Each structure stands twice: as structure tokens, then as C-alpha cells.
């Protein structure tokens, strides 16, 4: 039985939810007017995986920053292994992979125990690279990742600092069928208001059907859920005019559970833009938002990864990628939910609890 693993996953999912909202708040504060697209879950797997090879102050700070402190470490790794194993699929309904690749300088010797544990618990791999040729190391890493993800995760690395002997690449892609397909013949170019006064034409999908829908008077936003065929849900959060900043600032762990209380199944005429979203983050910068930096410094804390005095993670990048289109399986007067102005998007795994993706979409066709 995997009861205990399932309980650990439930606690870890609450933690990625909080992490996602904290990261979104900080990212939106420093960079307003930009799309933000990342996977709190995928980011968490990367640093939890690093806990298998980290000791002392570096280990303690990752666990403090990511709030991995509530359960024993054995349960932390068993919980993440369960989440990854359950979500990892290449079926007609769902294609999801969480990649964790450490690229280590070929002069270093990654330790067997760490290699085995990372592969067994996270499906993470270590690839030897020649960091003395930075240009070639970048092409090698980008080609390795593009080949592994079948062209879903491309150009992951744009720069490698000299002296880097260890680079972490974390990446997640998603393809899923909706529980009910949208008819592509009904998809049309429609106005997407970038601002109250300024608009761009975007491919807008349309379907009339039964959906979990609601309105939050506290955060002044419409909530709409569109289910995928597998137990995953696309949650659209549409702020009222001039309430986006209020919505971002009000986001909490309790916010989400409150949104769930406001929903009911109703007939809705839904208009949703198609998306092909990617988000790329320098994790050294992103993790400063949760006070995690020792992993990026030399402290003699990574000997379990490889013996070497000055060892640190030189660089770490996260890339999240998702396609949202018509693909899927197959009363009362309809409500109308038009997603045609800046919105938040949460891709939520219901069965294996987790926030797979969190997005702030200011422009669905925006790069």
C-alpha cells in the first residue's frame, strides 16, 4: 500500500501551492505587464532532489525555504517519488514529464549512492559535460534536453558562467485531452484586451456546457474550471476590471480552499484563448524570493554529490511548457465567461494533489 506516500504527497501539494503564490507575487511585483508561467511542483522536485546530496547549512536552508521541514526526509523523498511516478505519462489523454538533469564537469566523479537515489526517487539523471568549452557545453545541454523532450523544451540554456562545474536543468511539459473537446470549427479570432482600451486578436476557443463556476467578492474575480480527461483541472481566475493587482496580493493557501466553496456546476458559454506558453527562470534569482542561496555557494556541503572542496550549483534553470488547444475526449440558461483580458491560470492535479502550473497571462499570444 502507498497510503503513507499519498499522505506525504498531500502535504507537499499544500507547500507547492503556497510556493507558487509567493513566487507569482514577487515576480509580478518586480515585472508587471509580463506573462509569468512556471511550475511550482517542478521547481520543488529539483531542490528536494538536491537534498539527497546536500548536508548541513545548505540542506537546512533548502528545507527551511521550501518548507520541507514538517515530515521526515524519508517521507519527503517517498512523497515526491509518488507524485512524479503518478503524473509521468505518455498516453492519448496525458503527456507529462518532469525532467531533472544535473550537468557535471567530466573531471568530477558523481557518487553512486546519490546517482541511484536521484534516479530511483526522482527519475533525475547526471550527464558529464566539458565546461572548459562553454559554447559546446550549452549546445550539448540544449540538444540533450530538446531530444529527450521531443522538441518540447528547447534553448533551455542561454548562458553559462565560466567556472561552472555543475548546472541544474529542471523542466516540465504538458499535453492533455480535455474531458470534453472544443470544436475547432467554432474557434475564432476575437479581441483580447491587453488594457481596457487596447486589444489584439487571439484564437479564442468556445464551448457551451456544464462547468464548475463561481465568483469571489473578496478578491473580485470570476472562477471557472475546465476539467481534463485525467483527474487534472484548468482553473481560470478572471479579475474584474482594475482588480488584477488586488487579486495577486490576496493569493494564499486558504484563498484556493475558499474558491472551491464558491463553485457550483452550471451551464456556461465559455470563451478561452488557445495557448502555447513557455516560461524560463534563472533559479538562483527566483529562489532569492524564498531565501535559498547556499546551494549556489561553496560551503563543503555537496560531497555526497561529488568530492570537491569548492562544489556548488553554478547555475540552475527552470523551464515550463504547455499547450492549450481544442483536443479532448469525444437545461438552464447559460452563464457567460469570456477569458479576454489578463487572467491567472492554475493547472491543478486533483487525484495526485498538486499545482502543476501557475500562470499570469497578460497576453495569450505574447512571448
Author numbering: 37 to 366, 378 to 414
What do the study's own words say?
Previously, visceral adipose tissue-derived serpin (referred to as vaspin in this paper; serpinA12 according to the serpin nomenclature) was identified as a putative member of the serine protease inhibitor family, which was expressed in visceral adipose tissue of Otsuka Long-Evans Tokushima Fatty (OLETF) rats at the age when obesity and insulin plasma concentrations reach a peak.
Based on sequence homology with α1-antitrypsin vaspin has been predicted to belong to the serpin protein family. As expected, nearby regions match closely in a superposition onto related serpins. It has been shown that the serpin inhibitory mechanism is critically dependent on the length of the RCL and is furthermore structurally based on conserved small side-chain amino acids within the hinge region of inhibitory serpins. The variant vaspinA369P fails to inhibit hK7 activity and the mutation prevents complex formation with the protease.
